[PDB]
Amino acid sequence: MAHMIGVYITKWGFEVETFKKALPKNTEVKTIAFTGDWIEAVRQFYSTVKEIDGHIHLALNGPSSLAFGCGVIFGSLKTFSFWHYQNGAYHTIPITNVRALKQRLKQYNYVEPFYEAGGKDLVVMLNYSHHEIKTAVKEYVMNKLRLENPSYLEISLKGITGNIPIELMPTVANETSSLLQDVKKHQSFDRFHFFFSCPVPIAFMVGVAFGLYDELVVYNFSGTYEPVLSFKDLKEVK
Amino acid sequence: MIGVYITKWGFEVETFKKALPKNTEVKTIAFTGDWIEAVRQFYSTVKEIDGHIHLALNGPSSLAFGCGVIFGSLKTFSFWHYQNGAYHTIPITNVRALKQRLKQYNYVEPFYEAGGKDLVVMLNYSHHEIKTAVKEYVMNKLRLENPSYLEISLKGITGNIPIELMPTVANETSSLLQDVKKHQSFDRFHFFFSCPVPIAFMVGVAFGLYDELVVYNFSGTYEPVLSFKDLKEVK
């Protein structure tokens, strides 16, 4: 009865065959159309994975902010393979168990946190990819969020910024997850504000690990930053 | 596989075809002094190709940069550079290697002059300063308000860049173009070139269409030839 299925979240739709051909023979693929409505796509994603019995093959052709949202409501009852499009075709992320991602670490090999102590709003920046975002996020926060002296957590990577292989993505996601729990020891935050310069698979896996435990807001860059998912919306998806 | 040849002429395509693997078709894109039209036709040609692309370009580095910007960074490519009377392949089988952000730079160095939120970028591998001429143009024709300036130039290397170092120089340049954003959040980048075509292409690939950018070309004087709005509308 239980049988593997593909779920493809895409800003387009026409290109789904590339994903399908990468999967085992006779794997059905359910397409979720992302049209610039984050909460609707997350809702449809939840609806789809809720009723799936079996291993889920995921791919997401779309923003990392959406990937993070989908991760947050994914939960920990289902297994998945994450497929990523690179230098030719789709390749599976080394199959990462959900419980494995939430493992807390004492030693980090890749992530480098820079914590700036402030108030109860924490601005989280995953500064992992080619495009440098720190000053852009701070300018946006200062001009648009109307917060008093927010705390900042900028996370950069040692060595691999802008060139993260598939094979390191589970490790980077695990390390990020562990840091996001560590930071809560500094103080009790009211709210986490998430900004990404980050591969989609990592964003998804970090969302899976972090979950919907804290008040959070997810932000997307499209010429400027805007909030695209809130804790309230994500809670109401279930 | 196919080859795409972007050229200010057209008649000379056969040496490119001959350099490629047997039975590679080549599409010529004829540049006639309209940058946005050539970039449009380039994008139209490569848009639905996923596999490896062979590229060559006979024309200005400013065009090469524009083609790089709309190429994206999902597709692998070989750039065939014409040097010392023949074509030489620059194979890029991992595009992310061009986008790796660096702490250690071996071949290029930044010279940053702090100003406002317009950044004037000079990609100058010539071993003779272009800053005075660019500044005169900026002050007199663009009338920008207290722009920041970033010159990127060679260090250590005293002459031409060998083929073998062109990916490295492009990678380092691209990394510096992101590193400068640590100084402040810029609103707009203005690109001026004195540089080899393959480097311009590779830097365009990495930089992408992520910041408001304007591309300038030197032909006796400087003029803008590509804007962010035009490039956005190509897609």
Same structural domain for residues A204 and A222? yes
Same structural domain for residues A111 and A86? no
Cβ proximity of A67 and A207 under 8 Å: yes
CATH of the domain at A155: 3.40.50
Q: How many helices (H) and strands (E) does chain B have?
A: 7, 11
Do B182 and A136 make contact, defined as CB atoms within 8 angstroms?
no
Do B99 and A130 make contact, defined as CB atoms within 8 angstroms?
yes
Same structural domain for residues A164 and A217? yes
- Which residue in chain A is spatially nearest to B206 when comparing CA positions? A130
Q: Give CA–CA dist A4/A80, Å, rounded.
A: 9
Do A87 and B97 make contact, defined as CB atoms within 8 angstroms?
no
Same structural domain for residues A139 and A73? no
**Cβ neighbours of B14 (radius 10 Å):** 10
Cβ proximity of B90 and B158 under 8 Å: no
Do A88 and B175 make contact, defined as CB atoms within 8 angstroms?
no
Q: Give CA–CA dist A129/A137, Å, rounded.
A: 15
Name A57's bridge partners. A6, A81
B156: helix, coil or strand?
A: coil
Do A162 and B210 make contact, defined as CB atoms within 8 angstroms?
no
Mutation for testing the B interface, residue in A128, A130, A164 having most B CBs under 10 Å: A130
- Domain around A30: 5-97
CA B11 to chain centre: 24
- Using only the alpha carbons of chain A, give its radius of gyration: 17
Q: Shortest CB distance from A87 goes to which of B93, B100, B181?
A: B93
Do B100 and A163 make contact, defined as CB atoms within 8 angstroms?
yes
- Which residue in chain B is spatially nearest to A222 when comparing CA positions? B210
A144: helix, coil or strand?
A: helix
Same structural domain for residues A70 and A109? no
Kindly report the three-state secondary structure assignment for every residue of A96-118.
CCHHHHCCCCCCCCCEEEEEECC
B95: contact with A, CB 8 A cutoff? yes
Phi and psi (nearest 5°) for A214? -115, 150
Same structural domain for residues A13 and A87? yes
Cβ proximity of A72 and A212 under 8 Å: yes
A138: contact with B, CB 8 A cutoff? yes
Mutation for testing the A interface, residue in B47, B171, B178 having most A CBs under 10 Å: B178
Name A82's bridge partners. A58
Same structural domain for residues A173 and A115? yes
Q: Give CA–CA dist A75/A73, Å, rounded.
A: 6
Do B50 and A88 make contact, defined as CB atoms within 8 angstroms?
yes
Distance from CA of A86 to the nearest CA of B (A): 6
Cβ proximity of A156 and A188 under 8 Å: no
Name A176's bridge partners. none
Q: Region of A204 please: left (phi>0), alpha (psi -120 to 50) or beta.
A: alpha
Report in angstroms the alpha-carbon separations of A79 from A19, A36, A97, B103: 18, 27, 7, 38
A137: helix, coil or strand?
A: helix
Q: In what order do the strands lie in the sheet with A111-116?
A: A111-116, A151-157, A121-127, A191-197, A216-222, A224-230
Secondary-structure percent of chain B, ordered helix, strand, coil, rounded to 5? 35, 30, 35
End of a domain among A97, A128, A151? A97
Those residues whose C-beta lies under 8 Å from the C-beta of residue A173, and which sit 6 or more positions away, are A96, A101, A201, A202, A205, A206, A209
Amino acid at A121: D
Given resolution (angstroms): 1.8
End of a domain among A79, A97, A115? A97
Same structural domain for residues A9 and A81? yes
Q: Whose structure tokens read 């500064």?
A: A127
Distance from CA of B215 to the nearest CA of A (A): 18
Phi and psi (nearest 5°) for A14? -65, -25
**Cβ neighbours of B146 (radius 10 Å):** 9
Q: How is residue B188 written in tokens? A: 């707009």
Total residue length of chain B: 235
A18: contact with B, CB 8 A cutoff? yes
Same structural domain for residues A127 and A160? yes
Q: Give CA–CA dist A200/A67, Å, rounded.
A: 6
Do A138 and B206 make contact, defined as CB atoms within 8 angstroms?
no
**Burial group, residue A193, by CB count within 10 angstroms (0-12, 13-18, 19+):** buried
DSSP E strand boundaries for A11-148: 29-33, 56-61, 80-86, 89-92, 111-116, 121-127
A31: contact with B, CB 8 A cutoff? no
Residues of chain A contacting residue B208, judged by C-beta atoms under 8 Å apart: 131
Residues of chain A contacting residue B231, judged by C-beta atoms under 8 Å apart: none
Q: Region of B10 please: left (phi>0), alpha (psi -120 to 50) or beta.
A: left
> How far apart, in Å, do the first and last CA atoms of chain A sit?
25
- Which residue in chain A is spatially nearest to B183 when comparing CA positions? A135
DSSP E strand boundaries for chain B: 2-7, 25-30, 53-58, 77-83, 86-92, 108-113, 118-124, 148-154, 188-194, 212-219, 221-227
Amino acid at A112: E
Q: Shortest CB distance from A163 goes to which of B93, B96, B182?
A: B96
Number of domains in chain B: 1
A143: contact with B, CB 8 A cutoff? no
End of a domain among A97, A128, A156? A97
Q: Whose structure tokens read 């999967």?
A: A23
B104: contact with A, CB 8 A cutoff? no
- Which residue in chain A is spatially nearest to B205 when comparing CA positions? A130
Q: Shortest CB distance from B178 goes to which of A86, A130, A139?
A: A130
Do B76 and A88 make contact, defined as CB atoms within 8 angstroms?
yes
Q: How is residue B108 written in tokens? A: 């290029």
Same structural domain for residues A230 and A124? yes
**Burial group, residue A48, by CB count within 10 angstroms (0-12, 13-18, 19+):** middle
Secondary-structure percent of chain A, ordered helix, strand, coil, rounded to 5? 35, 30, 35
Same structural domain for residues A93 and A148? no
